[PDB]
C-alpha cells in the first residue's frame, strides 16, 4: 500500500509545462529515502519542508506536478520568480511548502531534428495565479483587430515548440521537473511515512 512515486518520476512521458500534469496522492504510505539519496537529480530545492525529516511526518494531500522545461528555465520554478515559464506556464505561491526536483532528460525527450511535442506558452495578457493551468490555444490578439481564429498580424499562436535537439547546449537541453506540494490541515492524515 505504498504511494505511487515511481509512476510520476519514472513515467515514460512528461507533459508540456503549459499543460502540467498533477497527481493526487492520498491514503498511502511513502518512502522518501528513494529521493535525496539518489544522485540523478541536478537540482533538489525544498521550501518550507525538510526532505530529510519527511520519512516520519504526515500530510493530508501531496500533489506531484510534472512537466518539461529548459535548463535555463529551471530557476523560474521557484516561489517569487519571474519569467515566461513562471508567469505564463507554471507559477508557485509565495508561501509554497514543498520541493522542486529536476534532472537532465536529454537522452529521453530530445529527438534528432526537434521533439516539437513539448510546448510552452509564449503570449498571455496577464500572469498566472499560483497553481494555475492555462491550456488555451486561442489566437493571441496583440491589437484591436479581431483575429477570428486565424494567425496573422497582431494574431499569434500562444504556444511555442521547444525544439530539443540533442546537439544543443546544456542550457537548451530538456529538463524533467517534478514539483511536490505538501499540505497539512485538520486531521485526515492518509499520507504518512514509515
Amino acid at each position: 500500500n505504498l504511494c505511487p512515486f515511481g509512476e510520476v518520476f519514472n513515467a515514460t512521458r512528461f507533459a508540456s509545462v503549459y499543460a502540467w500534469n498533477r497527481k493526487r496522492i492520498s491514503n498511502c504510505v511513502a518512502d522518501y529515502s528513494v529521493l535525496y539519496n539518489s544522485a540523478s537529480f541536478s537540482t533538489f530545492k525544498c521550501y518550507g519542508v525538510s526532505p530529510t525529516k519527511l520519512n516520519d511526518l504526515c500530510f493530508t494531500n501531496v500533489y506531484a506536478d510534472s512537466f518539461v522545461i529548459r535548463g535555463d528555465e529551471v530557476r523560474q520554478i521557484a516561489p517569487g520568480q519571474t519569467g515566461k515559464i513562471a508567469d505564463y506556464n507554471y507559477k508557485l505561491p509565495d508561501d509554497f511548502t514543498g520541493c522542486v526536483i529536476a534532472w537532465n532528460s536529454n537522452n529521453l525527450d530530445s529527438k534528432v531534428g526537434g521533439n516539437y511535442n513539448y510546448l510552452y506558452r509564449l503570449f498571455r495578457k496577464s500572469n498566472l495565479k499560483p497553481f494555475e493551468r492555462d491550456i488555451s490555444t486561442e489566437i493571441y490578439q496583440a491589437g484591436s483587430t479581431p483575429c477570428n481564429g486565424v494567425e496573422g498580424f497582431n494574431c499569434y499562436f500562444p504556444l511555442q515548440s521547444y525544439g530539443f535537439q540533442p546537439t544543443n547546449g546544456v542550457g537548451y537541453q530538456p529538463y524533467r521537473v517534478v514539483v511536490l506540494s505538501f499540505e497539512l490541515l485538520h486531521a485526515p492524515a492518509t499520507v504518512c511515512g514509515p
Epitope: K84, Y140, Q165, N168, Y172
Partner: antibody, heavy 117, light 108 residues
Framework: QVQLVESGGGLIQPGGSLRLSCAAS????????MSWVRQAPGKGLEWVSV???????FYADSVKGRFTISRDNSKSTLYLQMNSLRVEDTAVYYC???????????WGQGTLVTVSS | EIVLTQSPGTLSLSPGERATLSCRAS??????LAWYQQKPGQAPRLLIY???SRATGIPDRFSGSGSGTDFTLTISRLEPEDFAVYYC?????????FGQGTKLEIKR
C-alpha cells in the same frame, strides 16, 4: 501600419535623470513585449530593457537599478525612466516592439541621449 | 554574455553581384538568430528571424542560413538600396546580444 515615435532625448549632466517616451500605433502596448535598444555613437547595438505582455520587467546589468521601463495603456506610450545617468550611457535610444522576447520587428526613429558635464 | 562576431568588417561589391556575410557565435544558439539592416541615419529593420525565416515585406533576394555557431546571410542581385550596415542578433540565451555589423559598399 505600425508607428513608433520617441521623445525625451537631449543633454543631461552625469547623475541627472531623464525620461524617454515612445508613442505607439498599430497594436496594443498592454499585449505586446516591448524593448529599449540603445546604440552608442559609432558603436554597435546594445539591448537595455524589456517589459513583458504580462508586466514583467527585465534590465541589462549595466543599467539595472538605474533604469525603469514602464507602459501606459491609456496613452499608448512606453516609458524608460533613466536615473543616475553616466557618461557611458551616451547613446541613441531606440524603442522597438519585441516578439516574445526574441527579436525586434518594429523600431522607432530613435532619440539621442547625451550625458556630459 | 555570448559574443557575436561578423565577417568581413566591410564588404565592397558592385550592383548585381551576390553578397555573403558571416556571424559566428561564442556558444551554440540553435537557430535563435536574427538579421537586421540599418541604413545611415535610420533605425534597424528586421530581415531574417529564426536564422532562416524571412520577415514580412522582405524581398526574396535575402536569405538566412546557418545553425549553432555559424550563420550566413546572403543577398543576391544587389540593388543600390540594399547597401547598409547589417547586424546579427542572437536570442538563445539572455542577455540578447548583437554584432559589430558589416558595412556593405558599392564598388566602382
Amino acid at each position: 501600419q505600425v508607428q513608433l515615435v520617441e521623445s525625451g532625448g537631449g543633454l543631461i549632466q552625469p547623475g541627472g535623470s531623464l525620461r524617454l517616451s515612445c508613442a505607439a500605433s498599430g497594436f496594443t502596448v498592454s499585449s505586446n513585449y516591448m524593448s529599449w535598444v540603445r546604440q552608442a555613437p559609432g558603436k554597435g547595438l546594445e539591448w537595455v530593457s524589456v517589459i513583458y505582455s504580462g508586466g514583467s520587467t527585465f534590465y541589462a546589468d549595466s543599467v539595472k537599478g538605474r533604469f525603469t521601463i514602464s507602459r501606459d495603456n491609456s496613452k499608448s506610450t512606453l516609458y524608460l525612466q533613466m536615473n543616475s545617468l553616466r557618461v557611458e550611457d551616451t547613446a541613441v535610444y531606440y524603442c522597438a516592439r519585441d516578439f516574445g522576447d526574441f527579436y525586434f520587428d518594429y523600431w522607432g526613429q530613435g532619440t539621442l541621449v547625451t550625458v556630459s558635464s | 554574455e555570448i559574443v557575436l562576431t561578423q565577417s568581413p568588417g566591410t564588404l565592397s561589391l558592385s550592383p548585381g553581384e551576390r553578397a555573403t556575410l558571416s556571424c559566428r557565435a561564442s556558444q551554440s544558439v540553435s537557430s535563435y538568430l536574427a538579421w537586421y539592416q540599418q541604413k545611415p541615419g535610420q533605425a534597424p529593420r528586421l530581415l531574417i528571424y529564426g536564422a532562416s525565416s524571412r520577415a514580412t515585406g522582405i524581398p526574396d533576394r535575402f536569405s538566412g542560413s546557418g545553425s549553432g555557431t555559424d550563420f550566413t546571410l546572403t543577398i543576391s542581385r544587389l540593388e543600390p538600396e540594399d547597401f547598409a550596415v547589417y547586424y546579427c542578433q542572437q536570442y538563445g540565451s539572455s542577455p540578447r546580444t548583437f554584432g559589430q555589423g558589416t558595412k556593405l559598399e558599392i564598388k566602382r
